[PDB]
Amino acid sequence: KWVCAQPSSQKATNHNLHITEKLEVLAKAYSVQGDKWRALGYAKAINALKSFHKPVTSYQEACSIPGIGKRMAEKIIEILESGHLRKLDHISESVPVLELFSNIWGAGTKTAQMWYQQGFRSLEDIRSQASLTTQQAIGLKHYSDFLERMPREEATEIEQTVQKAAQAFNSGLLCVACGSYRRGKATCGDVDVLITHPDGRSHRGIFSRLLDSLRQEGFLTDDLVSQEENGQQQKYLGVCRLPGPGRRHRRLDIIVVPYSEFACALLYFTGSAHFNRSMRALAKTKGMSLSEHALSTAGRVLPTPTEKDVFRLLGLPYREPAERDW
Template sequence: MASGLAFPSIFLLESHLTEDELESLKRQIRSLTTDPGKTDVFLGKLSNRERAQFELRRLGVVTVEKRQSRTRASARADTDSAPNLEESPAKRRKTGARAPSPIVISGSSEDDEPVQIVPPPKETDTIKVVKLAWFTESVARGEVLPLSDYTVYEGRRLLAEPAIMPSPAHVSRAEGILKRAQADAAGSQQPQGGKPHFMQARRKKFDGMPPPRPSLTRMTTSEKERVENLPPIPEFLHTTYSCQRPTPVHGPNDKFVEALKTIRLARQLMGDKIGIRAYSTTIATIAAYPYELSTPSEVSRLPGCGPKTAELFREFQNNGGHVREADDDEADAKLSVLRLFYNIWGVAETTARSFYNRGWRDLDDVIDYGWKELTRVQQIGVKYYDELQELLTRAQVEAIADRVLEHANSIHDGFQMVIAGGYRRGKALSGDVDIIISHSDESVTHLLIRRLVLSLEKAGLVTHTLTLSTANSERGQEAVSWKGNAPNHGLDSTASGGVGFDTLDKALVVWQEPMEPADQEGDKAGETQPNTNPHRRVDIIVTPWKTVGCAVLGWSGGTTFQRDLRRYCKNERALRFDSSGARSRVDGSPVDLEGYYGNDPATDMLTAERRVFEALELEFRPPNERCTG
């Protein structure tokens, strides 16, 4: 029993815990506290440092990460080997036992008394964020296990601000100071001779870290007049779910959105997960705003935006459509290399940083020093790098999709097809081709992907098959099972790779159109010329008819649209949704969103998609209104 173990004081982080888990833990943890300021151990379902820091900030716990210090033995060795020099006064000040003297800050005029500030102690208490497994395994073993093996983040708690100790004479002036402050607030003129008294000695110091600079959105008289005549914020923008908004492929603020996307990509390449989410929310809001932005104040009033975004827009306005941070990111040498690696097929941002940290700076370095370590997908991505960066026109996308459908129908008549991804959202150019095919007879789609890819290979259309998954067929073409509050592993995304990549039967292939007979003229020796048509990336997805609407919806929205669709289903409908279907979060049972099991199957794939919107009580948004970025 947990009650018999001497656990330290624990604060429970509730994120990612189900209600049942939360209640069970509250009953078991006898040393549980609800005050984050009075505990040194934070317990939760966390696996990375960034999330731990985010949870602490959300609770108002300010910390600085604790660095691993040297061992005492190494410190002694350094002392023994160091020259025997007399300690400098600065050194004695750091290591001496005397308490620090108060810092005295003079007033702004001769009449002001000095203010004494007592600095906070250098060392503050250490806090740790530990995995839930520490508690559960301790209970299972009947002993409190060491925290070190389960610690996600360790930091020092920082004091919010040093205490200000006024002198007796200064206390007597308090009433006058307050009166002057009130006069300033009422719009009186600032007294000459210095800053207001109540602003003296207001410098925060976070253990060597510079204080954050406040963001101020300044407003001119003309701006104030424009603000008074701004259009009302559309009602749909007040929702937190971008899947409830119409977001067109092109809007009145596209150029500013592109600058924000440049900054977001830089945050992504540098591993700033919180920044990625924040910028994604901002981008989705501005992309859905139907009016051309005119002032920073207009930006700051939008949900998901704030002073930071407003200042970026001010730069955008004043600098002829340029944002300094975005321009700096574009010109940054390191980010340029990371973008190069990130654009390799099969390389995510983590792998791109790994390549860079090894000292690699171009594709030749990857080939020379790491070729054998690359996956087959990555090797193909490097080999055909330039060709795979070429974008496809809508006509080229349609031609490839028609060939795939032709081969599917040669195996069995009656297949239907939808071209998903950016093409379906209305983009003029696409980086790859996403094709969803299905058949009203479920037995026909079972293991079809193998036969279809083989047919395309024999026709010389597919040169490489990089991934072939039959996971959906192997589980009886049912929706992915619900695994409690585990991370969602079932989303198919149009972003590279997506999340939960093996949800549906699919194949990732390299496509190359055959040479036309007129282009295959042989040379004098009778040999034909090599195929010079560019290689293309093609994703072929096969879905059973009972969840075809979920598949089409799951592969047709922008990244933020898909993220918010899953959040909506979780928070508002208690469902786990992905491209293979939906399941109840209450009992894990499949949920029929398309009327298939009611003996009323949809007649076509797009009708099935509309039914999913209706079942989720969402207003239908055509694909060209799902462009959240």
């Protein structure tokens, strides 16, 4: 019953599309209002519906699906029998505004709520009257770019620009696009670049020089999260734009990790997000702990040279990245 234990290709044959589309609207509404645990239950139910092997015929049949309970089976049959979901007609008027505000990179549910209770209703209100962090100011000026997904091929060019720049300093550096790119998706919301060195030595100073190299050449246009540490890993989030006409500003995430942590970092950064949460929860039930750095016990780091070792240690069959798209 664990998502991390099954191939996400089951979702490709979604036999209940018009039901999950309406539930997705409700899930998004609960999210932007900060009710994260109710949102999480809807997300879980929707993946369960997407991978069910047939159309849901009845209340009893919907309840036979792990992740579907009484209240969800009720809504499934309401849609199945009426083509409509009455719950959608009573969503608060604030929700689309809170969604608009939380689409700004750097403004979450609490910031969106604060701006709404100040009377703000549009982006023009935020621009002219809201006090913005430097991050939110960059998220606001690239609002429409950051909402658009990029073709697979553009992410390739972005990773290549980072790779060649990193290898100009040390030709041994290994660079890998992760996230939705490594999962084989046709489009990517951002580019997630994982960097390590197989010599196993610490390379503290290279990252700083890599980032200035990308700024000096005009590729990096803004910082969102400047270089920072996470244990022995280093992380940067920023804004790049490929050269030439008709290019959008794209978000770029770069993590540098010691080789000893490569498999677990690669596993995390490949996702999906719900795959990771499912897998980490499974580890917790087995007295273990899974993070970006390591698989541990309740803490002894267990040796994980490759992703397959994590799957094995958790009793899970291996899944190619494309089968983790939950």
